[model samples]
Target: KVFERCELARTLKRLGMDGYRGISLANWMCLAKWESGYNTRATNYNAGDRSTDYGIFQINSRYWCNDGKTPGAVNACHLSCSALLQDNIADAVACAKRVVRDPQGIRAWFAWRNRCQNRDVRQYVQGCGV
Candidate 1:
């Protein structure tokens, strides 16, 4: 129904980015994985109320969506942000860094992504930058 990151990347490639191979490729996987397990419509049921953030970057609809977190979990269950937001991986990475600074103490985030043995939820961040 909506244009996810993969589709957008294809569109970007068609427009240009053909030369930025490794960078785009790495970024492509990194962003989706780090954000929403490459799920453009994913959600986090682990956390408490209003904790299930969604989309590629797991952009919490409450914080990034138009209606904010005002809507209850039911109304915002399948919340998703605009493709424009996920289109900019740099910004998303920056935000993630701000929340969980890289190379500082990756294990600090261990609580959230500690279970990567099977590439579980933390697959993207497991031992990241280590």
Candidate 2:
């Protein structure tokens, strides 16, 4: 689950997210750093709601993915939550894209709030030439 920095940059750009709809590539990369350090195996069990966040993007089961054990799970991404934990994070990227498309936009990621909000992060992808 340890993605090469350039590889993550390439994947994001290939998915049309180099700077899609006002969200910048650098910003997203910065977000990824805090979310899971780009590791797809990352998981966080939030005591606040007793929900587990999975994947590099830290997608939540309460609103996005379904572990099939959580009752009343909305599962907006329509995939098993465990799927998000894979080393190949193509599905995780897709789910993150869907999350951002909703009304939340980049705010969909709390990491962005706690760590990446309103900062100059252009250096993240500067040398990659992506």
Pick the TM-score winner. 2
lDDT of 1: 0.41
For model 2, state the Cα shift of residue 3 in Å.
1.5
lDDT of 2: 0.84
Report the lDDT tens digits of candidate 2 across residue range 1-130.
8777878887778877866768888888988888888888999988777688998888999989989766676889988999899877778878888888898798988779878888888767877879
Taking the tens digit of each residue's C-alpha lDDT, what string does model 1 give over 1-130?
2344455455435544323422233343444555455554555643454444545556454444433444553322232344314544444433333333334322323433443322333233234331
lDDT of 2 at 18: 69
TM-score of each: 0.36, 0.91
For model 2, the stretches where C-alpha displacement exceeds 4 angstroms are none
lDDT of 1 at 112: 35
lDDT of every model, 2 decimals? 0.41, 0.84
